[PDB]
Amino acid sequence: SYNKDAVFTYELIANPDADYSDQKLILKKEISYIKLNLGINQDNKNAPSYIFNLLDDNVYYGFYRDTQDMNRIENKYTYAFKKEAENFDNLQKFNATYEGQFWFSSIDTPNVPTVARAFLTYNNGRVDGEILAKHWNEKLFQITGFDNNPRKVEIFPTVEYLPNSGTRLTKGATSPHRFQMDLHFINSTNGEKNKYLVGQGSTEQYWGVLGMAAAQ
């Protein structure tokens, strides 16, 4: 049921008559399947309904916009991968480094997409990494292995306020605002094993998706 040729999204149609009455801001929610090209896919550069990053024919990540009450809009982060392309090798002594991006929104700005840079190192099973601000080397999150499983990480904040947010987080490894993430190693269509790494997670205060590529 993976199909980068028909990716689910919502078209959210503004209700014009809400300009002059107490009707919902959104008139209708309509399903709309997108066919992805390699790289960044979006319909509008300044008010996109969705952004998806097809890293490879076998895996994408991104978000589409949703609303539960037809008034408030929030980004829904997701990822998908060809099932057969997932790598199930034993990665307990894995040696590799990944570089990519973390896309997220915060509870007080649920429709505002924040992009950060992400780095993850596998050294003989030890899993450690970091999430940095897009344009400068400020550390936003620490990444660490969870439960001695190379496919599970724990991500915890190292700042009290994320970009574009005024929601105060607690910092550090015992922070109740940390979260755990299941990761999936995806092989490339050009025969690179474990080339791509995707997962997603959430807390009450922020939620997002992680997508990464191996350093060759």
Residue numbers in the entry: 103 to 318
What does the publication say?
Here, we report that PmSLP binds host complement factor I (FI) and facilitates cleavage of complement components C3b and C4b independently of any cofactors (e.g., FH, C4BP), thereby allowing the pathogen to evade host defence. We show that PmSLP-1 not only exhibits a high-affinity interaction with bovine complement factor I, but it also serves as a co-factor for factor I to promote cleavage of complement C3b and C4b. This protein-protein interaction thus plays a crucial role in modulating the complement activation on the bacterial cell surface and increasing bacterial resistance to complement-mediated killing.
To identify structural features of PmSLP-1 that would aid in its function, we sought a high-resolution crystal structure of the protein. Thus, to improve the chance of protein crystallization, we modified the protein construct by removing the first 94 N-terminal residues, predicted to be disordered, and mutating a stretch of surface-exposed, charged residues (E315A, K316A, and K317A) at the C-terminus. By removing the flexible N-terminal region and lowering the surface entropy on the C-terminus, we were able obtain protein crystals with high diffraction quality. The modified variant PmSLP-195 and its selenomethionine derivative were then used to solve and refine the protein structure to a resolution of 2.0 Å. PmSLP-1 is a predominantly β-stranded structure which forms an N-terminal domain (NTD) and a C-terminal domain (CTD) connected by a 13-residue linker peptide. The eight β-strands on the C-terminus fold into a barrel, coined the barrel domain, and the six β-strands on the N-terminus form an open-hand-like structure, referred to as the handle domain. These two domains are held stably together through a network of hydrogen bonds. We also observed two short helices present in the loop regions of the protein. Noticeably, the overall architecture of PmSLP-1 resembles that of previously known Slam-dependent SLPs. We postulate that the conserved β-barrel CTD serves as a Slam-recognition motif whereas the varying NTD and loop regions dictate the protein function through specific protein interactions.
